[PDB]
């Protein structure tokens, strides 16, 4: 049985950068998304994700929860994910903590499409750290989940598909699952 | 697989009768529910529900939504779900409509203990009229759910384990799917 996601609906935003628009996480006044949303069509092959994150301004950055705009006041990068601080903390934080898990473990998967949740899935990880599941398509950004008491214990952001068909991501500070590299 | 449940979670309420508790759903400023709240374990063998209701009063309900107390204003029967009117209208009722739908359908059931949600999950409803899920005690008055756009349509509420341990419930009209009755003795 998947864990009911209302108190993680509240937390999906939309981020978006050139034309790359994925999912994000907004937690008091932070919004974590996958950093190669500063990436484009040709900066995936080789990054230099140091050069390209001080390249950047903060209105470089469309961060929208639904139909209300945030203003990023400052940006930085947390190994793999890109840590966007915004002028107001989000209302609707639960009580929440960053937790890794390890193959075996289930958690609840809240698949979002640009931002607005689409479904609850519950997976597992497999020993060689991927997740297999077309619900994840497109839904870069969308996070995993287990929930005890009133606490939230985030364990997993989805980041890229592979070529095989399975899917790979991080936890909430960057590490990826297994040996991946967003490239 | 399973619909969001944060649009249901905010209508989710704890309803207590004696020493009975079991799941509400709370839309605008009404409270449905399952009527064998008014029961305790002994009545359910074979419970005359007219005559059980007729001695109950408005404060012999207890109903909470997460921490603030609704008073029971009224109260009426309609078929097998009981309809408590309170004082005060959910904040947070979505767009919502009641529906019936038949087997091999699929719904999200979004599994509820003491008025807390505890998870959701798809299932659909076999050509016998029940449901194969995890339900333990005190799930009673959990719902069942799909989602068009931004409306939710209600279809079931969950009453009781069967004997086979598959599981019977109603429409939100308090009608049970199949020929199964809320009461032990008697059943089919």
């Known amino acids: 049985?998947?864990?009911?996601?209302?108190?993680?609906?509240?937390?999906?935003?939309?981020?978006?950068?050139?034309?790359?628009?994925?999912?994000?996480?907004?937690?008091?006044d932070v919004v974590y998304c996958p950093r190669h949303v500063i990436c484009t069509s040709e900066d995936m092959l080789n990054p230099n994700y140091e050069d390209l994150l001080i390249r950047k301004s903060n209105?470089?950055?469309?961060?929208?929860?639904?139909?209300?705009?945030?203003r990023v006041i400052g940006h930085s990068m947390q190994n793999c994910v890109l840590k966007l601080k915004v002028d107001t903390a989000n209302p609707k934080t639960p009580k929440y903590?960053?937790?890794?898990?390890?193959?075996?473990?289930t958690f609840?998967?809240?698949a979002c499409y640009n931002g607005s949740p689409s479904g609850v899935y519950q997976c597992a990880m497999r020993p060689n750290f991927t997740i297999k599941g077309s619900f994840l398509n497109g839904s870069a950004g969308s996070v995993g989940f287990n929930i005890d008491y009133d606490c939230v214990s985030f364990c997993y952001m989805h980041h890229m598909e592979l070529p095989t068909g399975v899917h790979?991501?991080?936890?909430?500070?960057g590490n990826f699952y297994g040996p991946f590299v967003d490239r």
């Open 168 to 173: 790979a991501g991080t936890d909430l500070e």
């Open 59 to 70: 209105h470089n950055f469309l961060v929208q929860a639904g139909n209300v705009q945030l």
């Open 1 to 28: 049985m998947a864990f009911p996601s209302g108190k993680v609906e509240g937390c999906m935003v939309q981020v978006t950068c050139g034309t790359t628009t994925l999912n994000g996480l907004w937690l008091d």
């Open 97 to 105: 903590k960053f937790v890794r898990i390890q193959p075996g473990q």
């Open 108 to 110: 609840s998967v809240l």
